[PDB]
């Protein structure tokens, strides 16, 4: 019964939730672990909805690897990588 579009939608929201929680406080280390796991696992960085967090995400060492600076712009690719997981790409 579980549909593809709703799951990615939910996984993307869960990611945003973890991202926001990870950058606000140092003592929300579970959220920091989740975010690090997602970035490392999906080879991504940042939220396409919560783009303002990006600098704070970078400053909190949540994106050690992976080039996200495509041209003179930084593209938040986690929402895409999540879409690719449920589509069968990447």
């Amino acid at each position: 019964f579980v549909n593809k579009d709703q799951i990615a939608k939910d996984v993307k929201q869960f990611y945003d939730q973890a991202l926001q929680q990870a950058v606000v406080d140092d003592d929300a280390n579970n959220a920091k672990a989740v975010v690090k796991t997602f970035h490392e696992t999906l080879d991504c960085c940042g939220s396409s909805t919560l783009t303002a967090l990006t600098t704070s995400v970078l400053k909190n060492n949540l994106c050690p690897s992976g080039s996200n600076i495509i041209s003179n712009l930084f593209k938040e690719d986690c929402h895409q990588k999540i879409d690719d997981l449920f589509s069968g790409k990447h």
Partner: single-chain antibody
Framework: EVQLVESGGGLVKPGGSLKLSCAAS????????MHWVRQTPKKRLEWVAT????????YFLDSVKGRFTISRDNAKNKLDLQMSSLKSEDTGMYYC?????????????WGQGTLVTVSADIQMTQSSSSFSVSLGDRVTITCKAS??????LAWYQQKPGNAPRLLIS???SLETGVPSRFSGSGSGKDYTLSITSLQTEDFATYYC?????????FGGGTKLEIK
């Protein structure tokens, strides 16, 4: 039609308290981060506070931190700024603004504003305070950043009496209902707003704003005057 109506403003004594409220309608309030932006008596635009879509997360301008509180009622479609320990610096028009996306710090829609009068960091540089241009002319307004912005730059037009209106986001992308004669270009630190075939409605103050690293700083503005 997206509508933001702010109430609460008034005359206040130093150290005093005020409770600004914004009444949103025409969109899904629960899906957007909401902000408070104030315009100083010398017409300088300044971001003050942000409330997350759910309301659990809160961001403040360092100078208002610990004196200002933000709250929201998603059921009542309203947003509030509780101002306490009021200083002179706080005097200005207080605009309630809906974020462009969930949380990209650019301001797609603004309310009319509430005046708050109190009785007695990335630097965004806009070269000229004003430009004397005639009708039908061509202008280029320049905006310089102290640091790389990564094209995360917005342009606002503001006619007097009215609130700022968003023209461009992401340095280049024109908003819907913005005429082809307006164009934005640039990269890294140097950005431009170009207006061709100047029409009468084009005479106004133009501001650039960066949304890369907080606080979301604005430029001083470039007022286009007729000659």
């Amino acid at each position: 039609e997206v509508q933001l109506v702010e109430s609460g403003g008034g005359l206040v004594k130093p150290g005093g308290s005020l409770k600004l409220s914004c009444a949103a309608s025409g969109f899904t309030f629960s899906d957007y981060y909401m902000h408070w932006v104030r315009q100083t008596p010398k017409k300088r635009l300044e971001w003050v506070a942000t409330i997350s879509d759910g309301g659990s997360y809160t961001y403040f301008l360092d100078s208002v931190k610990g004196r200002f509180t933000i709250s929201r009622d998603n059921a009542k479609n309203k947003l509030d700024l509780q101002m306490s320990s009021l200083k002179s610096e706080d005097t200005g028009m207080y605009y309630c603004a809906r974020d462009g996306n969930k949380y990209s710090a650019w301001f797609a829609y603004w309310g009319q504003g509430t005046l708050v009068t109190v009785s007695a960091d990335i630097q965004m540089t806009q070269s000229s305070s004003s430009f004397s241009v005639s009708l039908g002319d061509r202008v280029t307004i320049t905006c310089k950043a102290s640091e790389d912005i990564y094209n995360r730059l917005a342009w606002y037009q503001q006619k007097p009496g009215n609130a700022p209106r968003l023209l461009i986001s992401g340095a280049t992308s024109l908003e819907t209902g913005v005429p082809s004669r307006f164009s934005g270009s640039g990269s890294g630190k140097d950005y431009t707003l170009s207006i061709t075939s100047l029409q009468t409605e084009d005479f106004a103050t133009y501001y650039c704003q960066q949304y890369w690293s907080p606080p979301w700083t604005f430029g001083g503005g470039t007022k286009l005057e007729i000659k």
